[PDB]
Design an enzyme around this catalytic site. Structure first.
Site, short mmCIF file in Angstrom:
data_model
loop_
_atom_site.label_atom_id
_atom_site.label_comp_id
_atom_site.label_asym_id
_atom_site.label_seq_id
_atom_site.Cartn_x
_atom_site.Cartn_y
_atom_site.Cartn_z
N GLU A 108 11.03 12.19 -30.99
CA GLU A 108 9.57 12.27 -31.12
C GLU A 108 8.90 12.58 -29.85
O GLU A 108 8.16 11.76 -29.31
CB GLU A 108 8.93 11.03 -31.75
CG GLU A 108 9.97 10.29 -32.61
CD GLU A 108 9.30 9.49 -33.69
OE1 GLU A 108 8.77 10.02 -34.67
OE2 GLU A 108 9.25 8.21 -33.41
N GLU A 137 17.04 10.90 -39.92
CA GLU A 137 16.47 9.69 -40.46
C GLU A 137 16.00 9.95 -41.87
O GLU A 137 15.17 10.83 -42.17
CB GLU A 137 15.31 9.17 -39.62
CG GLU A 137 15.71 8.71 -38.22
CD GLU A 137 14.43 8.44 -37.50
OE1 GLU A 137 13.47 8.17 -38.13
OE2 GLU A 137 14.42 8.63 -36.20
#
Lengths: 409, 204
Positions: free
Chosen positions: B51, B127
């Site tokens: 991220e 994920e």
């Protein structure tokens, strides 16, 4: 069987136009096109022969070119004395498409240097670019979504004989029902069909008269060089005849003749003589070296059907197979036999969500049923077996979206 | 193995990573990592972090690795999960059949993702299937895709354990704390508990 198509007499001048191809090139945005016409002659060659090529827009003349015979040097031996290529510039051409089938008229005149006309030939022309880029089948720059149907030449009373009226009826119907394209299952059509699709606006798939389904394996003939000559004739004469029609946008090698070497030769031939349209063949697995498009028949939306040798993967799966880059367009799907077309929405939904799923051709247009009588010569729809015919596949000749009389299912 | 680089809280996410000034600092994160673990047969993929959006510095760092250690692929999700800085497409939380069209960073259905024009890389989720509380609904929809698509090769469930801490009542009785239970402001409550197992390692 019989003599099912027209019969004509044509009177030509000894020194004549024997053939002519048309072509169109554009810049990065279609703001300028170049029409390229190549004309060939037969007969006595003379220095006073010329060729004039004019492109009309109704009553308006848009471009004209004159020249004398004899073209570029192509090899060590020279060039063609009896050929010539003209090149007309066209600014801001009106593009042809099924949504707007804008057409132009080209006149090809053979005359003398003094201007004395020997003969004239002509054709409607429509400016378009059909290309496959990055996995997508584009048209004039945009990715098409094929809404099409397969369609034979069938007539309840006439048999295999076609006629305008029928041809037009079928045309109006498909359009009213939101069809975009049509596939000539599974042979070249009646000459006028192409003209009608050019003007009404419909995407055509010109198919070669070759199907050897009943062979075991399907390969038998098409993988046999002794048959190359016979097959080649069906591909080549096909391209030689319809190649100037704006509506034809794809060539097809024929149908259900497995996958042979003749198939590859043939795919290469077209690729060479007409780089302008893609080539498809479905036999042998639908994703062979003989096809520019993955074109399966009856492959499901999400369920695989793993036949040995020739599996039909789920259409969503096929696209992503390791190494696969081609667009996918079903040549046959949604088998409309009787009370059918269940699950249709499922395809359309995939069609609209996957960029590389670009349509397909419903199987099929009309029911191949015939008419019969009895007492009062009162008609009745006949099918397989109804004639004493053996063998036969009974009702399997009935799978259209419309009854043989053009009334809707 | 993954570099210690996460800059989620920035705006845009890409703010420090597209900055040459921070290159050296990120650099150290990747290099010392590679330098230290390179002999582990278990390590099979390298990750530039998490991220952080997509910056030029990612691009350089990817390259760096590719040259120093060509025995492992490199992956990174930032900037859309399919950038020039990753070898595997590795979205986080994409649906099996449903497209999530975020602007600039859409998360296509995973089956459709493989087929996008031009795409040829494999897809492994970095994920997927958030196990927060009473979850895992749908799991099977996934395991089936994985099994039908050759190029869908798995994923990593988020995540192993809940990030709960142990507190004590007046009797000194033990008890699992969460977001804010420490006076920690600001917090994200129970969002730290996404495990497939209790911190004690007792299963959900």
């Amino acid at each position: 069987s019989g003599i099912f198509r027209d019969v004509s007499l044509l009177h030509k001048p000894t020194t004549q136009i024997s053939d002519f191809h048309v072509a169109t090139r554009f810049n990065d945005d279609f703001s300028r096109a170049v029409l390229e016409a190549e004309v060939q002659m037969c007969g006595e060659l003379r220095d006073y022969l010329r060729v004039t090529v004019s492109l009309w827009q109704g009553e308006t003349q848009v471009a004209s070119g004159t020249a004398p015979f004899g073209g570029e040097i192509i090899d060590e031996r020279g060039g063609y004395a009896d050929r010539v290529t003209l090149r007309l510039n066209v600014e801001n051409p009106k593009l042809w498409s099924a949504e707007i089938p804008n057409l132009y008229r080209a006149v090809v005149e053979l005359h003398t240097a003094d201007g004395t006309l020997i003969e004239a030939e002509a054709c409607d022309v429509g400016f378009r670019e059909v290309r496959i880029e990055n996995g997508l089948l584009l048209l004039n720059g945009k990715p098409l979504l094929i809404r099409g149907v397969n369609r034979h030449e069938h007539h309840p009373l006439h048999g295999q004989v076609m006629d305008e009226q029928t041809m037009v009826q079928d045309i109006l119907l498909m359009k009213q029902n939101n069809f975009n394209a049509v596939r000539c299952s599974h042979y070249p059509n009646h000459p006028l069909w192409y003209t009608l699709c050019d003007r009404y606006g419909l995407y055509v798939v010109d198919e070669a008269n070759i199907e050897t389904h009943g062979m075991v394996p399907m390969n038998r003939l098409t993988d046999d060089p002794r048959w190359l000559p016979a097959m080649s004739e069906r591909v080549t004469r096909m391209v030689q005849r319809d190649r100037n029609h704006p509506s034809v946008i794809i060539w097809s090698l024929g149908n259900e003749s497995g996958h042979g070497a003749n198939h590859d030769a043939l795919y290469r031939w077209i690729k060479s003589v007409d780089p302008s349209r893609p080539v498809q063949y479905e036999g042998g697995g639908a994703d062979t070296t003989a096809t520019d498009i993955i074109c399966p028949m009856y492959a499901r939306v999400d369920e695989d059907q793993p036949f040995p040798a020739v599996p039909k993967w789920s259409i969503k799966k096929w696209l992503s197979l390791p190494g696969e880059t081609r667009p996918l367009i079903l040549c046959e799907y949604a088998h409309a036999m009787g009370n059918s077309l269940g699950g249709f929405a499922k395809y359309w939904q995939a069609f609209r969500q996957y960029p590389r799923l670009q349509g397909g051709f419903v199987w099929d247009w009309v029911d191949q049923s015939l008419i019969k009588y009895d007492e009062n010569g009162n008609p009745w729809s006949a099918y397989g077996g109804d004639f004493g015919d053996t063998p036969n596949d009974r009702q399997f000749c009935m799978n259209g979206l419309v009854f043989a009389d053009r009334t809707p299912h």
